[PDB]
Design an enzyme around this catalytic site. Sequence first.
Site, PDB file in Angstrom:
ATOM      1  N   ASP A 152      -2.626   0.161   6.642  1.00  0.00           N
ATOM      2  CA  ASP A 152      -3.479  -0.359   5.581  1.00  0.00           C
ATOM      3  C   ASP A 152      -2.925  -1.657   5.009  1.00  0.00           C
ATOM      4  O   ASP A 152      -3.682  -2.576   4.698  1.00  0.00           O
ATOM      5  CB  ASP A 152      -3.656   0.675   4.464  1.00  0.00           C
ATOM      6  CG  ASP A 152      -4.553   1.827   4.873  1.00  0.00           C
ATOM      7  OD1 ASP A 152      -5.373   1.637   5.797  1.00  0.00           O
ATOM      8  OD2 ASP A 152      -4.440   2.918   4.273  1.00  0.00           O
ATOM      9  N   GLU A 171       0.889   5.787   0.151  1.00  0.00           N
ATOM     10  CA  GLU A 171       0.247   7.082   0.304  1.00  0.00           C
ATOM     11  C   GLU A 171       0.931   8.011  -0.686  1.00  0.00           C
ATOM     12  O   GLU A 171       2.139   7.917  -0.899  1.00  0.00           O
ATOM     13  CB  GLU A 171       0.382   7.605   1.737  1.00  0.00           C
ATOM     14  CG  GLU A 171      -0.242   6.696   2.787  1.00  0.00           C
ATOM     15  CD  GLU A 171      -1.746   6.546   2.627  1.00  0.00           C
ATOM     16  OE1 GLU A 171      -2.304   5.550   3.138  1.00  0.00           O
ATOM     17  OE2 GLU A 171      -2.374   7.423   1.994  1.00  0.00           O
ATOM     18  N   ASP A 197       0.831  -1.195   0.000  1.00  0.00           N
ATOM     19  CA  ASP A 197       0.000   0.000   0.000  1.00  0.00           C
ATOM     20  C   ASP A 197       0.866   1.247   0.000  1.00  0.00           C
ATOM     21  O   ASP A 197       1.966   1.253   0.549  1.00  0.00           O
ATOM     22  CB  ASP A 197      -0.968   0.026   1.180  1.00  0.00           C
ATOM     23  CG  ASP A 197      -2.036   1.089   1.020  1.00  0.00           C
ATOM     24  OD1 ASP A 197      -2.886   0.935   0.117  1.00  0.00           O
ATOM     25  OD2 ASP A 197      -2.023   2.076   1.789  1.00  0.00           O
ATOM     26  N   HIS A 203      -4.819   6.427   7.194  1.00  0.00           N
ATOM     27  CA  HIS A 203      -3.959   7.145   6.253  1.00  0.00           C
ATOM     28  C   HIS A 203      -2.503   6.694   6.332  1.00  0.00           C
ATOM     29  O   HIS A 203      -1.625   7.289   5.709  1.00  0.00           O
ATOM     30  CB  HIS A 203      -4.066   8.657   6.468  1.00  0.00           C
ATOM     31  CG  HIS A 203      -5.460   9.190   6.340  1.00  0.00           C
ATOM     32  ND1 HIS A 203      -6.292   8.848   5.295  1.00  0.00           N
ATOM     33  CD2 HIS A 203      -6.167  10.036   7.122  1.00  0.00           C
ATOM     34  CE1 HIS A 203      -7.453   9.465   5.441  1.00  0.00           C
ATOM     35  NE2 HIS A 203      -7.402  10.193   6.541  1.00  0.00           N
TER      36      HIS A 203
HETATM   37 MG   LIG Z   1      -4.306   3.298   0.550  1.00  0.00          MG
END
Ligand SMILES: [Mg+2]
Lengths: 208, 208
Positions: A179, A18, A16, A174
Amino acid sequence: TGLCDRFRGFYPVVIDVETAGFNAKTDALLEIAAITLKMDEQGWLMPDTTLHFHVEPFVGANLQPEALAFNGIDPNDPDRGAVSEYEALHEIFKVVRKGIKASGCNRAIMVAHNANFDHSFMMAAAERASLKRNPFHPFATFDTAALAGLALGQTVLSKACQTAGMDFDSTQAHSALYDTERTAVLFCEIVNRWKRLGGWPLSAAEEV
Amino acid sequence: TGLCDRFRGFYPVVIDVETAGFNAKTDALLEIAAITLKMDEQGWLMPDTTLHFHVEPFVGANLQPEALAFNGIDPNDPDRGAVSEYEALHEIFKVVRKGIKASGCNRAIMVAHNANFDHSFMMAAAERASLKRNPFHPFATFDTAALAGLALGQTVLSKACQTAGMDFDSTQAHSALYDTERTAVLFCEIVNRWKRLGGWPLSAAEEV
Ligand SMILES: [Mg+2]
Ligand SMILES: [Co+2]
Ligand SMILES: [Mg+2]
């Protein structure tokens, strides 16, 4: 019962990211987390190695204000312990290659929620870092949104996890690392549940 | 047992395209097929409406020779009975909106093999044609490659189909319509076997 037997030689790696926007080519990568998986002797799937990085925006990268307001990341904060895209991906690729050899797989496949987004960012960053021998399949992914749609009738990460009987902490949503871990647990639960119900291996259904 | 209940209100539509290259933005769309699905009274999933089109390359589109060599399409053959991207997509969207309303869903989600490829081509064509109120989800998809990975331990369309006990005719693999139909039957088999093995509804497992 081996990891290499499960996905025709694909070595699943949960990822994952950001970002500072929606465009993989032009927008900064801000965080990346990676969790390799492994199978025990009986063929059950579980997290193996966990990696996580705060990522310094590449030179020339765009930063969308709305993206930064969404994920709450401040790239200018010198206390965020950031490293270059090269350092982050080099470490991940190194661990992933090791796992592929150790397990007898041919290639890594990215596992992610709405996988294409994360895939595009990771690949673009690898490109920018001039990384050689990217262990990841250039277009194949295991999208957990789709998988959760099948298994749990839900496509939203948080709702899928809840339906799967998992905790999900909204205040941590976030964080790439958070995540990735939730997504890894979700994926494993889905795969394991399938096996448990006698969907795998294919022979099980006849009790063989 | 309702289709609208199965995927949190998503109306699954199977899609496959044939193209003149790997770039959705710059390369021509050449073929597109669409297969809506329906659930019977007992909640079993099956194909509903089937659409198929030969598509005229958009004005200014690139045509990769290698791509035309791959899929065997000759965009200049006047007997291929092509239609504009508008005509094709406007017809698909019309049927899709109709099915969404009839079934009580909220939105369509594309089902496709290595779905983002097809998704990106359909979306770009949709933009080019200036179609209003695209009923499809702008980024969510149900990738059958990933799903076949889960259910069947295979990610290649042809192999996944064979493993699922379906016929697969290689001489027909370059037809969008053929691929869409095989993918539709594959997706249905995967959803349905999940149900039959007691994976859905979620309540089912405690009723044995
Ligand atoms: Mg994400
Ligand atoms: Co023809
Ligand atoms: Mg195709």
